C-alpha cells in the first residue's frame, strides 16, 4: 500500500540570498526532506504570524512573508525545523527618493 515517515527533516534546497526592493514584500521558501512544522527567525528573535509577517508551510514546503520591506530588514534569516538549521542574507534596495507631480501640461 503506502509507506510511513523515515529520517528527520533536512533542507534540500535551503534558503538563498533573497534580494528585493524596499516597500515590496519579500518572500522566501525552502524545501523539506519531510513534512513538519518549521520556524523562521530574523536576527535575535523568532518570527511570528500575525504582525506584518506570514509563516506557513504546505506539506514539505516552507514560505515566509515579510510585509513592509526595509533597509533594516535586510540582514540574515534563519530557518529551524528540528535539528537542522539554514540561513541566508536578505538585501533591500531603498526606493529612490522621488516626488509626485500633478501634471506636465494643462488643457
Curated annotation (Swiss-Prot):
Name of encoding gene: OBSCN
Disease with which this protein is associated in UniProt: Rhabdomyolysis 1: An autosomal recessive disorder characterized by severe and recurrent rhabdomyolysis, usually with onset in the teenage years. Some of the episodes may be triggered by exercise or heat; others occur spontaneously. Rhabdomyolysis is the rapid breakdown of damaged or injured skeletal myofibres and may require intensive care management. Muscle breakdown results in release of myofibrillar content into the extracellular space and circulation, resulting in hyperCKemia (hyperCK) and myoglobinuria.
Disulphide bond pairs: 30-79
Domain Ig-like: 8-91
Cellular localization per UniProt: Cytoplasm, Myofibril, Sarcomere, M line; Cytoplasm, Myofibril, Sarcomere, Z line; Cell membrane, Sarcolemma; Nucleus
Protein known as: Obscurin
Organism: Homo sapiens
Subunit structure: Interacts (via protein kinase domain 2) with CDH2 and (via protein kinase domain 1) with ATP1B1. Isoform 3 interacts with TTN/titin and calmodulin. Isoform 3 interacts with ANK1 isoform Mu17/ank1.5.
Purpose of the protein: Structural component of striated muscles which plays a role in myofibrillogenesis. Probably involved in the assembly of myosin into sarcomeric A bands in striated muscle. Has serine/threonine protein kinase activity and phosphorylates N-cadherin CDH2 and sodium/potassium-transporting ATPase subunit ATP1B1.
Family: Belongs to the protein kinase superfamily. CAMK Ser/Thr protein kinase family.
Superkingdom field: Eukaryota
Post-translational modification remark: Autophosphorylated by protein kinase domains 1 and 2.
